Design a protein around this nucleic acid. Structure first.
Ligand SMILES: NC[C@@H]1O[C@H](O[C@H]2[C@@H](O)[C@H](O[C@@H]3[C@@H](O)[C@H](N)C[C@H](N)[C@H]3O[C@H]3O[C@H](CO)[C@@H](O)[C@H](O)[C@H]3N)O[C@@H]2CO)[C@H](N)[C@@H](O)[C@@H]1O
Ligand SMILES: NC[C@@H]1O[C@H](O[C@H]2[C@@H](O)[C@H](O[C@@H]3[C@@H](O)[C@H](N)C[C@H](N)[C@H]3O[C@H]3O[C@H](CO)[C@@H](O)[C@H](O)[C@H]3N)O[C@@H]2CO)[C@H](N)[C@@H](O)[C@@H]1O
Ligand SMILES: NC[C@@H]1O[C@H](O[C@H]2[C@@H](O)[C@H](O[C@@H]3[C@@H](O)[C@H](N)C[C@H](N)[C@H]3O[C@H]3O[C@H](CO)[C@@H](O)[C@H](O)[C@H]3N)O[C@@H]2CO)[C@H](N)[C@@H](O)[C@@H]1O
Ligand SMILES: [Mg+2]
Ligand SMILES: [Mg+2]
Ligand SMILES: [Mg+2]
Ligand SMILES: [Mg+2]
Ligand SMILES: [Mg+2]
Ligand SMILES: [Mg+2]
Ligand SMILES: [Mg+2]
Ligand SMILES: [Mg+2]
Ligand SMILES: [Mg+2]
Ligand SMILES: [Mg+2]
Ligand SMILES: [Mg+2]
Ligand SMILES: [Mg+2]
Ligand SMILES: [Mg+2]
Ligand SMILES: [Mg+2]
Ligand SMILES: [Mg+2]
Ligand SMILES: [Mg+2]
Ligand SMILES: [Mg+2]
Ligand SMILES: [Mg+2]
Ligand SMILES: [Mg+2]
Ligand SMILES: [Mg+2]
Ligand SMILES: [Mg+2]
Ligand SMILES: [Mg+2]
Ligand SMILES: [Mg+2]
Ligand SMILES: [Mg+2]
Ligand SMILES: [Mg+2]
Ligand SMILES: [Mg+2]
Ligand SMILES: [Mg+2]
Ligand SMILES: [Mg+2]
Ligand SMILES: [Mg+2]
Ligand SMILES: [Mg+2]
Ligand SMILES: [Mg+2]
Ligand SMILES: [Mg+2]
Ligand SMILES: [Mg+2]
Ligand SMILES: [Mg+2]
Ligand SMILES: [Mg+2]
Ligand SMILES: [Mg+2]
Ligand SMILES: [Mg+2]
Ligand SMILES: [Mg+2]
Ligand SMILES: [Mg+2]
Ligand SMILES: [Mg+2]
Ligand SMILES: [Mg+2]
Ligand SMILES: [Mg+2]
Ligand SMILES: [Mg+2]
Ligand SMILES: [Mg+2]
Ligand SMILES: [Mg+2]
Ligand SMILES: [Mg+2]
Ligand SMILES: [Mg+2]
Ligand SMILES: [Mg+2]
Ligand SMILES: [Mg+2]
Ligand SMILES: [Mg+2]
Ligand SMILES: [Mg+2]
Ligand SMILES: [Mg+2]
Ligand SMILES: [Mg+2]
Ligand SMILES: [Mg+2]
Ligand SMILES: [Mg+2]
Ligand SMILES: [Mg+2]
Ligand SMILES: [Mg+2]
Ligand SMILES: [Mg+2]
Ligand SMILES: [Mg+2]
Ligand SMILES: [Mg+2]
Ligand SMILES: [Mg+2]
Ligand SMILES: [Mg+2]
Ligand SMILES: [Mg+2]
Ligand SMILES: [Mg+2]
Ligand SMILES: [Mg+2]
Ligand SMILES: [Mg+2]
Ligand SMILES: [Mg+2]
Ligand SMILES: [Mg+2]
Ligand SMILES: [Mg+2]
Ligand SMILES: [Mg+2]
Ligand SMILES: [Mg+2]
Ligand SMILES: [Mg+2]
Ligand SMILES: [Mg+2]
Ligand SMILES: [Mg+2]
Ligand SMILES: [Mg+2]
Ligand SMILES: [Mg+2]
Ligand SMILES: [Mg+2]
Ligand SMILES: [Mg+2]
Ligand SMILES: [Mg+2]
Ligand SMILES: [Mg+2]
Ligand SMILES: [Mg+2]
Ligand SMILES: [Mg+2]
Ligand SMILES: [Mg+2]
Ligand SMILES: [Mg+2]
Ligand SMILES: [Mg+2]
Ligand SMILES: [Mg+2]
Ligand SMILES: [Mg+2]
Ligand SMILES: [Mg+2]
Ligand SMILES: [Mg+2]
Ligand SMILES: [Mg+2]
Ligand SMILES: [Mg+2]
Ligand SMILES: [Mg+2]
Ligand SMILES: [Mg+2]
Ligand SMILES: [Mg+2]
Ligand SMILES: [Mg+2]
Ligand SMILES: [Mg+2]
Ligand SMILES: [Mg+2]
Ligand SMILES: [Mg+2]
Ligand SMILES: [Mg+2]
Ligand SMILES: [Mg+2]
Ligand SMILES: [Mg+2]
Ligand SMILES: [Mg+2]
Ligand SMILES: [Mg+2]
Ligand SMILES: [Mg+2]
Ligand SMILES: [Mg+2]
Ligand SMILES: [Mg+2]
Ligand SMILES: [Mg+2]
Ligand SMILES: [Mg+2]
Ligand SMILES: [Mg+2]
Ligand SMILES: [Mg+2]
Ligand SMILES: [Mg+2]
Ligand SMILES: [Mg+2]
Ligand SMILES: [Mg+2]
Ligand SMILES: [Mg+2]
Ligand SMILES: [Mg+2]
Ligand SMILES: [Mg+2]
Ligand SMILES: [Mg+2]
Ligand SMILES: [Mg+2]
Ligand SMILES: [Mg+2]
Ligand SMILES: [Mg+2]
Ligand SMILES: [Mg+2]
Ligand SMILES: [Mg+2]
Ligand SMILES: [Mg+2]
Ligand SMILES: [Mg+2]
Ligand SMILES: [Mg+2]
Ligand SMILES: [Mg+2]
Ligand SMILES: [Mg+2]
Ligand SMILES: [Mg+2]
Ligand SMILES: [Mg+2]
Ligand SMILES: [Mg+2]
Ligand SMILES: [Mg+2]
Ligand SMILES: [Mg+2]
Ligand SMILES: [Mg+2]
Ligand SMILES: [Mg+2]
Ligand SMILES: [Mg+2]
Ligand SMILES: [Mg+2]
Ligand SMILES: [Mg+2]
Ligand SMILES: [Mg+2]
Ligand SMILES: [Mg+2]
Ligand SMILES: [Mg+2]
Ligand SMILES: [Mg+2]
Ligand SMILES: [Mg+2]
Ligand SMILES: [Mg+2]
Ligand SMILES: [Mg+2]
Ligand SMILES: [Mg+2]
Ligand SMILES: [Mg+2]
Ligand SMILES: [Mg+2]
Ligand SMILES: [Mg+2]
Ligand SMILES: [Mg+2]
Ligand SMILES: [Mg+2]
Ligand SMILES: [Mg+2]
Ligand SMILES: [Mg+2]
Ligand SMILES: [Mg+2]
Ligand SMILES: [Mg+2]
Ligand SMILES: [Mg+2]
Ligand SMILES: [Mg+2]
Ligand SMILES: [Mg+2]
Ligand SMILES: [Mg+2]
Ligand SMILES: [Mg+2]
Ligand SMILES: [Mg+2]
Ligand SMILES: [Mg+2]
Ligand SMILES: [Mg+2]
Ligand SMILES: [Mg+2]
Ligand SMILES: [Mg+2]
Ligand SMILES: [Mg+2]
Ligand SMILES: [Mg+2]
Ligand SMILES: [Mg+2]
Ligand SMILES: [Mg+2]
Ligand SMILES: [Mg+2]
Ligand SMILES: [Mg+2]
Ligand SMILES: [Mg+2]
Ligand SMILES: [Mg+2]
Ligand SMILES: [Mg+2]
Ligand SMILES: [Mg+2]
Ligand SMILES: [Mg+2]
Ligand SMILES: [Mg+2]
Ligand SMILES: [Mg+2]
Ligand SMILES: [Mg+2]
Ligand SMILES: [Mg+2]
Ligand SMILES: [Mg+2]
Ligand SMILES: [Mg+2]
Ligand SMILES: [Mg+2]
Ligand SMILES: [Mg+2]
Ligand SMILES: [Mg+2]
Ligand SMILES: [Mg+2]
Ligand SMILES: [Mg+2]
Ligand SMILES: [Mg+2]
Ligand SMILES: [Mg+2]
Ligand SMILES: [Mg+2]
Ligand SMILES: [Mg+2]
Ligand SMILES: [Mg+2]
Ligand SMILES: [Mg+2]
Ligand SMILES: [Mg+2]
Ligand SMILES: [Mg+2]
Ligand SMILES: [Mg+2]
Ligand SMILES: [Mg+2]
Ligand SMILES: [Mg+2]
Ligand SMILES: [Zn+2]
Ligand SMILES: [Zn+2]
Lengths: 249, 112, 86, 50
RNA sequence: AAACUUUCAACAACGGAUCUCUUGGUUCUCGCAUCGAUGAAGAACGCAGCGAAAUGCGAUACGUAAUAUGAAUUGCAGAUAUUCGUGAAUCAUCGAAUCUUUGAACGCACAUUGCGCCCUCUGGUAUUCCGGAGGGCAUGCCUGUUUGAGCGUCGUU
RNA sequence: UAACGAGAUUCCCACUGUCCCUAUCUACUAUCUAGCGAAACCACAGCCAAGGGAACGGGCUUGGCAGAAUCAGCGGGGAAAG
RNA sequence: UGCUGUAAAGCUGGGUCGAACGGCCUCUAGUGCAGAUCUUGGUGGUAGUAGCAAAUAUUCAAAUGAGAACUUUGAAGACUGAAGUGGGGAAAGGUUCCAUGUCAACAGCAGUUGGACAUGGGUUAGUCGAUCCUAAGAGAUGGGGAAGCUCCGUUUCAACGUGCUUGAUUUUUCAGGCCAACCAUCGAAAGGGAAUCCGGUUAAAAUUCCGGAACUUGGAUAUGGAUUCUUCACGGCAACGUAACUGAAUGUGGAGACGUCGGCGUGAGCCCUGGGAGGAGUUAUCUUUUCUUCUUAACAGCUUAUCACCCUGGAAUUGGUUUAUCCGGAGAUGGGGUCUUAUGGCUGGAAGAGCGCGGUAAUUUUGCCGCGUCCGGUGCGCUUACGACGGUCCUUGAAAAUCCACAGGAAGGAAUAGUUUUCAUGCCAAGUCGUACUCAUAACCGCAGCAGGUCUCCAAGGUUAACAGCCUCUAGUUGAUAGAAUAAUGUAGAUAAGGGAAGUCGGCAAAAUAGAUCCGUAACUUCGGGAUAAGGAUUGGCUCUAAGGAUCGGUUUAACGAUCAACUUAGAACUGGUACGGACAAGGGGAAUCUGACUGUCUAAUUAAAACAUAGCAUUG
RNA sequence: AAUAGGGUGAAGCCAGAGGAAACUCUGGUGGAGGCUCGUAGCGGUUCUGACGUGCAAAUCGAUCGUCGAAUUUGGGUAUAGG
RNA sequence: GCGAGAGACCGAUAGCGAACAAGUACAGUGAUGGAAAGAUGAAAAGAACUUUGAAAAGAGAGUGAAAAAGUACGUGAAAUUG
């Protein structure tokens, strides 16, 4: 048969991300002496749209502690941050909207975003519009903190890992219908080539495992083993269950 | 009416291939290639067009006298009038308040 | 539509002249000669195309230097000049 | 085109110079076998290779 | 009976069989060991009094030198070319040279005759800018030289 | 299921040479001339009826017949060509 | 010409020809042709047959020539009709360009002609492009894979400057002071980007040559001016002004630099047009007439602007204000000012040029002379540029080279003299490559001079909603073998009495409708549509009527006078073989069923659909 | 880089009317939309027209879909035979 | 590759693809594909001259042993043709 649409993506020829119009990688500051021991103050200069992202980004200017130069950082904008606001980042920063604090300095119930998975990786968790991380509790003896992620998962992170206080701006975007195919075309015009999707059942058996037949039908179970091989994993991969989700999980 | 042609090998209506139509002393109507319109020098603080500064395409600033490219004030050809005034007042009041926050902490180092 | 009308849209050379072999087999976008292999150090040649070897091999050009090794070898690679007889 | 490279223009010069008829005094040489230039080229008929 | 069609013969056509050649090929045997960074094989562009090709050659361009030989070259032309001779012609021979732009290709680059830097000399009032001439600046590795680096480390104050 | 459709289908009004049933008109061809000048195809060829026969004959057998050289149309046949 | 042999074949008479060949005993083999839709070559019938019929269209005369339907010239008739059959280009071609000669082949007739053939000539750049920058991307290096051709990686586990800048030194040594996040390279003739215009000139080149007039960059460098004894200038409340009027390291900004629409304003060019000064055409009659010249470059100076901003001031009886709804105690209206110079004006350039006339020199290179070339108006006009605005996105709409300004204050500077080349003037240089011509119903690709394909700039008058269609000005063409006839059958186009789908699988095809104004407009509906639903009336010409404005001018009767100006709407009378969106242009409509929601997409070359996609829904990791 | 001329008339805004209020109604303005008629463009429905040894190895004519966006397109660049 | 000597080999549709300006002309974007094509005569003596013709050409003539050898060149079969 033929190479299916799943596998052609690994080569990444026409499946790379469209990044001409992107405004920068959204990251926290590099963890330095100022953030580890005290606090550093920066000012929000711009709040700009980043193509391909639902969340706006904020460009915040800090002074360099070691040489006479200005450093511009690209943070994910939390809702309520304004241009000219002072952002305080470090261990001793106060509980104000927009400040970047280590997780151990935040009491339980603190809503935080752009949280570091590992100390100094500059942000992994809760970066999309409207999402955030809830701090569940602390384990000071092991220097660990329990948090709740946007997926509903509870995670244990080093208490020295950093995060930004507040909710990521731009939430509620999904509340509006797209209506037109052109709206989705323009949405993916600045992300990557993943739209539109042809149903595998409407192709021929060479093109897809679902293709062929004198009627459009899959023919076998669409739940595929986790141990299946590339070229087979089309459908519901390692599906624990199927059908309409009824009741709570 | 007489019609015109481009004067260069470029046959396409691009931004750098703009023409104006001018009548010559020969009574003919010919195309004269025009250069791109200059953009105004803008404030680095508020983004408004700065007054008193000539509007030129960037290389042309090198070949003109300095009085055309600046204004006699602090931050003359760089910041706006209101933004320089606002910088000055902010600098004075905050530094004045810097003394207050310092003296207020030396008086509490004897009574507290 | 795919024949005569489409054949009218051929004005973009895929290949241009090669500096090594001068053949117009130099892929413009690939920056490689399909004939001579430029800019690779070795020459492109295959034993499944022996006629291609015939077309470009020793003796098909001038041999401006290998011409004369036999004649210099035959005299034992002399150094000096011939002396006129008395 | 009007805009052409030096490498192109030098090849077009050789093609013009090779597009001469046989010089007629060549037929007078002893044991001459060439009756005409058999490598003539028309611009419209056969295209070069640039 | 003409014409027409068909058959036959003669001559003329068409065409290139047949015969006969052959500086080619094919095969066997015998003998030899010699490409290139001292720049090969190959490519592009040029070169002649009058040349397009093939052959030859490289701005010293169908060749310069030397050696041998000994009066040509030749289609025409033409010596301020040559003849009992340092002397015509000749890839006859060849030991000295010339050998454009390239190419393993070597300053970087090349769908560009694009863009540098170093040394000496020279011209423009010039160490610096602009012009010209000549000579240089690639990579891996070896031996050696010089200059260095590391509380890796020895001695001493 | 409103709206949409060079999508499939039925009916009605209008309109009509679709038809009853055909007729007339125009230009360009076809036609004749000067010049120019291909191609498919071709075992040999070319009038019928019956017979027998590879059971549907241009040829064989038995009959009908049969008089040079030719032009425009035509689509029965060559179980025409591809 | 015969003879022999059953035969395969052998010999021989005559002709032709011109250099080798045979008999017999044997050896040897790439040894015998009618086929194989055999191979290569050559040739027929077909057959002087099919045919040389798209793109409206040609005709008379002269010249040349042996020869003219086809060449040249003249006269006429036409077409393309500014979305061209016009004028240029990118790609592609490569000498097709121009002149002379020229017709053997080619131009499916011809040929005196040609994009053919032959010989020559022709492409001139500091300013036009390349070159430089970076884009998606490509790709060396330290390295890491792979037996290897090579693969990965682009600052990556790297000791990564052939660094600079000064005071110099003439000791060709130095002394050192700063920095080295990022930095190989290639990659755009449409992106970014230093700088040129007018008139003239060739057979063929020109933003390239000639003439005049400019500009940029790099370099050198003197004079004037400017500035200093209050050393690195003054003025202005301010926005800010200037002929100038120190400023290292380092830092910060701006320009470069950016989407798409909608209406409005202004300019430029075009269109329309009024006097005056010329030229041509018509003139039986009419027409103070119809057509035409009346132009002004880059560059320099002065002036010139919406926005924005400054000073004054303190607002309800809220005011100002756009076609479009915003602004104001975070300071409106009012009054007064500052800036950008896009754009216009005046002047220089510059009338000397160019243009239109009149008079002359002469085989005459080429002219010489005189007159004029002036002042206006108009606009829902077209094209285009710009400006201030409004809308739009689950879309927010490149980079780099490069240039400038500012912050900063290192360092250096005067009094008998010092500094500075961001004010004026002056001096030198700008290399290399492309440059002719076609850009297509004949210069490219489709085997070819093929009705195909191929990216883009300029765009007149009338009718009109219109860049549609039709006619016309400029320009360019009049090219497509021709002549004679006009049967059948065609191809393309028209018409038809009465009937009106009875034809047919099926109304296939054709016909009917059609512009604009007024009236009127059903089910169903997601309330948005359906809708031009359906269905009626009108429309010419002429002569009038009515409505709709601009600019100025003064105790609020300017409620009036003066001047000027554009086409819109509505109405009336008369009129004609009752015609009038009179050509062109231009919906057929209605009631339902199946199906896909819709816009969209695909089988290039037999399938456009109910198929695919979509938003929406749901599941999985 | 390119895309005649029309139709419709979404938000927002102005004025007036009714109402005790909540609000409603009317006349304008405005210029939205993968809306619509329709050029160029892009496409290719039907005549199952022409041609079908063609102008053409896919064309010609009329008719037709769409025509401001999921638009058309040049050039550069990337993806290469199971 | 270089330098030689040979053959019961082939004899221009054969023999290497190429006896020749052969890896040439030419095709294809490219990798690649790739021909045809030898013979006047001992010697150009390659037909001076005249004449018809616009010319190519023809007719005389001339060269040659031969023009029944005229660069369409020795010999010149068949198909096909007058
Ligand atoms: N780019 C770096 C990272 O590589 C990793 O990618 C994976 C690959 O390096 C390798 O994964 C292989 C892959 O080579 C191969 N071509 C396909 C195969 N399905 C993968 O296998 C992977 O997924 C399967 C699922 O069944 C797991 O069982 C297995 O543990 C995991 N290695 O192992 C890694 C996972 O353990 C990250 N998963 C990926 O998200 C990221 O790109
Ligand atoms: N419009 C006033 C003047 O023009 C400027 O803007 C000019 C253009 O940038 C602007 O263009 C449009 C405009 O139609 C309308 N306001 C919408 C759009 N925001 C504007 O576009 C602009 O903004 C977008 C932001 O998305 C930028 O990405 C885009 O590059 C820029 N051109 O409209 C102006 C056309 O002349 C500024 N708006 C303003 O500061 C200035 O005073
Ligand atoms: N009547 C038709 C139309 O209305 C107009 O015409 C108007 C009148 O002339 C006409 O009526 C008049 C009648 O009053 C009086 N007798 C005068 C006139 N002769 C009549 O009219 C008659 O005259 C000629 C005859 O062919 C036509 O033009 C006209 O239509 C006809 N009705 O009817 C109209 C109103 O009364 C315009 N002429 C035009 O739009 C068109 O003709
Ligand atoms: Mg497969
Ligand atoms: Mg991360
Ligand atoms: Mg896709
Ligand atoms: Mg899917
Ligand atoms: Mg979906
Ligand atoms: Mg799908
Ligand atoms: Mg399928
Ligand atoms: Mg399968
Ligand atoms: Mg399966
Ligand atoms: Mg299936
Ligand atoms: Mg299904
Ligand atoms: Mg299904
Ligand atoms: Mg031009
Ligand atoms: Mg440009
Ligand atoms: Mg200019
Ligand atoms: Mg701007
Ligand atoms: Mg900023
Ligand atoms: Mg100023
Ligand atoms: Mg200057
Ligand atoms: Mg200046
Ligand atoms: Mg100024
Ligand atoms: Mg293309
Ligand atoms: Mg390509
Ligand atoms: Mg190499
Ligand atoms: Mg060589
Ligand atoms: Mg071109
Ligand atoms: Mg040219
Ligand atoms: Mg020629
Ligand atoms: Mg061609
Ligand atoms: Mg070729
Ligand atoms: Mg070329
Ligand atoms: Mg012959
Ligand atoms: Mg023979
Ligand atoms: Mg031999
Ligand atoms: Mg030399
Ligand atoms: Mg050489
Ligand atoms: Mg070369
Ligand atoms: Mg060099
Ligand atoms: Mg050069
Ligand atoms: Mg070179
Ligand atoms: Mg370069
Ligand atoms: Mg080495
Ligand atoms: Mg449909
Ligand atoms: Mg329908
Ligand atoms: Mg039904
Ligand atoms: Mg009829
Ligand atoms: Mg006939
Ligand atoms: Mg005839
Ligand atoms: Mg003919
Ligand atoms: Mg036949
Ligand atoms: Mg009978
Ligand atoms: Mg029978
Ligand atoms: Mg029988
Ligand atoms: Mg019978
Ligand atoms: Mg038969
Ligand atoms: Mg018999
Ligand atoms: Mg009989
Ligand atoms: Mg028949
Ligand atoms: Mg037949
Ligand atoms: Mg004999
Ligand atoms: Mg002989
Ligand atoms: Mg045999
Ligand atoms: Mg035979
Ligand atoms: Mg044959
Ligand atoms: Mg035949
Ligand atoms: Mg005929
Ligand atoms: Mg025809
Ligand atoms: Mg004609
Ligand atoms: Mg017309
Ligand atoms: Mg038109
Ligand atoms: Mg044109
Ligand atoms: Mg032209
Ligand atoms: Mg020439
Ligand atoms: Mg001529
Ligand atoms: Mg002809
Ligand atoms: Mg003549
Ligand atoms: Mg010509
Ligand atoms: Mg230049
Ligand atoms: Mg330039
Ligand atoms: Mg350069
Ligand atoms: Mg340069
Ligand atoms: Mg630059
Ligand atoms: Mg990159
Ligand atoms: Mg490279
Ligand atoms: Mg690499
Ligand atoms: Mg390496
Ligand atoms: Mg390696
Ligand atoms: Mg490492
Ligand atoms: Mg030294
Ligand atoms: Mg570059
Ligand atoms: Mg450019
Ligand atoms: Mg450009
Ligand atoms: Mg002049
Ligand atoms: Mg003049
Ligand atoms: Mg002059
Ligand atoms: Mg010209
Ligand atoms: Mg000058
Ligand atoms: Mg002063
Ligand atoms: Mg500085
Ligand atoms: Mg900065
Ligand atoms: Mg910017
Ligand atoms: Mg833009
Ligand atoms: Mg840009
Ligand atoms: Mg606008
Ligand atoms: Mg305007
Ligand atoms: Mg105007
Ligand atoms: Mg008249
Ligand atoms: Mg004031
Ligand atoms: Mg009041
Ligand atoms: Mg409006
Ligand atoms: Mg404010
Ligand atoms: Mg100006
Ligand atoms: Mg006078
Ligand atoms: Mg006057
Ligand atoms: Mg335009
Ligand atoms: Mg604008
Ligand atoms: Mg300063
Ligand atoms: Mg600072
Ligand atoms: Mg300062
Ligand atoms: Mg330069
Ligand atoms: Mg160049
Ligand atoms: Mg030109
Ligand atoms: Mg054109
Ligand atoms: Mg055209
Ligand atoms: Mg034609
Ligand atoms: Mg054509
Ligand atoms: Mg032409
Ligand atoms: Mg071809
Ligand atoms: Mg065409
Ligand atoms: Mg087109
Ligand atoms: Mg019109
Ligand atoms: Mg129109
Ligand atoms: Mg127009
Ligand atoms: Mg004609
Ligand atoms: Mg015609
Ligand atoms: Mg006729
Ligand atoms: Mg007829
Ligand atoms: Mg008919
Ligand atoms: Mg008719
Ligand atoms: Mg009729
Ligand atoms: Mg009638
Ligand atoms: Mg009837
Ligand atoms: Mg009657
Ligand atoms: Mg009737
Ligand atoms: Mg009826
Ligand atoms: Mg019926
Ligand atoms: Mg029926
Ligand atoms: Mg129909
Ligand atoms: Mg119809
Ligand atoms: Mg009728
Ligand atoms: Mg009608
Ligand atoms: Mg109606
Ligand atoms: Mg019509
Ligand atoms: Mg109907
Ligand atoms: Mg549908
Ligand atoms: Mg449904
Ligand atoms: Mg497509
Ligand atoms: Mg199809
Ligand atoms: Mg097919
Ligand atoms: Mg369709
Ligand atoms: Mg179809
Ligand atoms: Mg549903
Ligand atoms: Mg899940
Ligand atoms: Mg335009
Ligand atoms: Mg429209
Ligand atoms: Mg109200
Ligand atoms: Mg639409
Ligand atoms: Mg539509
Ligand atoms: Mg509708
Ligand atoms: Mg248009
Ligand atoms: Mg079309
Ligand atoms: Mg069609
Ligand atoms: Mg048909
Ligand atoms: Mg037919
Ligand atoms: Mg019709
Ligand atoms: Mg249509
Ligand atoms: Mg219709
Ligand atoms: Mg749009
Ligand atoms: Mg594009
Ligand atoms: Mg394979
Ligand atoms: Mg397989
Ligand atoms: Mg040998
Ligand atoms: Mg040998
Ligand atoms: Mg031997
Ligand atoms: Mg052979
Ligand atoms: Mg033979
Ligand atoms: Mg052969
Ligand atoms: Mg091949
Ligand atoms: Mg012979
Ligand atoms: Mg001979
Ligand atoms: Mg002899
Ligand atoms: Mg003769
Ligand atoms: Mg004789
Ligand atoms: Mg004889
Ligand atoms: Mg003979
Ligand atoms: Mg013969
Ligand atoms: Mg015969
Ligand atoms: Zn400001
Ligand atoms: Zn090559």
């Amino acid at each position: 048969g033929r190479v299916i649409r799943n596998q052609r993506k690994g080569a990444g020829s026409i499946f790379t991300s469209h990044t001409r119009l992107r405004k920068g990688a959204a990251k926290l500051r590099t963890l330095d002496y100022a953030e580890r021991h005290g606090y550093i103050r920066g000012v929000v200069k711009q709040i700009i749209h980043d193509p391909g992202r639902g969340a706006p980004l904020a460009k915040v200017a800090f002074r360099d502690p070691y040489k006479y130069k200005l450093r511009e950082e690209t943070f994910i904008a939390n809702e309520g941050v304004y241009t000219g606001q002072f952002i305080y980042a470090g261990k001793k920063a106060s509980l104000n909207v927009g400040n970047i604090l280590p997780l151990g300095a935040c009491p339980e119930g603190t809503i935080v975003s752009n949280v570091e998975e590992k100390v100094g990786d500059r942000g992994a968790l809760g970066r999309t519009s409207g999402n955030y991380v809830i701090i569940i509790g602390h384990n000071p003896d092991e220097n660990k903190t329990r948090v709740k992620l946007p997926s509903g998962a509870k995670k244990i992170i080093s208490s020295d890992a950093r995060g930004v206080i507040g909710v990521v701006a731009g939430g509620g975007r999904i509340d509006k219908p797209l209506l037109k195919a052109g709206r989705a075309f323009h949405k993916y015009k600045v992300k990557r080539n993943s739209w539109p999707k042809t149903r595998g059942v409407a192709m021929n058996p060479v093109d897809h495992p679902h293709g062929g037949g004198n009627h459009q039908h899959i023919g076998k179970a669409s739940t595929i083993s986790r141990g299946a091989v590339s070229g087979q994993k089309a459908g519901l991969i390692a599906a624990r269950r199927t059908g309409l989700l009824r009741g709570t999980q | 009416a007489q019609r015109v042609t481009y004067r260069r090998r470029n046959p396409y209506n691009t931004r750098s291939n703009k023409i104006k139509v001018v009548k010559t002393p020969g009574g003919k109507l010919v195309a004269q290639h025009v250069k791109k319109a200059a953009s105004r020098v803008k404030c680095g603080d508020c983004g408004s067009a700065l007054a008193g500064i000539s509007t030129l395409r960037p290389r042309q600033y090198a070949q003109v006298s300095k009085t055309h490219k600046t204004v006699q004030r602090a931050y003359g050809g760089s910041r706006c009038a209101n933004c320089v005034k606002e910088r000055i007042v902010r600098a004075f009041l905050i530094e004045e308040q810097k003394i207050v926050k310092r003296v207020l902490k030396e008086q509490q180092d004897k009574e507290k | 539509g795919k024949g005569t009308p489409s054949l009218g849209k051929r004005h973009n050379k895929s290949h241009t002249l090669c500096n090594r072999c001068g053949r117009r087999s130099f892929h413009v976008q690939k920056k490689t000669c399909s004939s001579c292999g430029y800019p690779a150090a070795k020459m492109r040649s295959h034993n499944w195309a022996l006629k291609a070897k015939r077309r470009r091999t020793t003796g098909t050009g001038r041999m401006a230097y290998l011409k004369h090794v036999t004649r210099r070898f035959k005299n034992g690679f002399q150094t000096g000049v011939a002396k006129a007889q008395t | 085109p009007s805009q052409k490279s030096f490498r192109t223009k030098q090849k077009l010069a050789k093609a013009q110079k090779q597009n001469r008829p046989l010089p007629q005094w060549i037929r007078l040489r002893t044991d001459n076998k060439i009756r005409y230039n058999a490598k003539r080229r028309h611009w419209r008929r056969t295209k070069l290779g640039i």
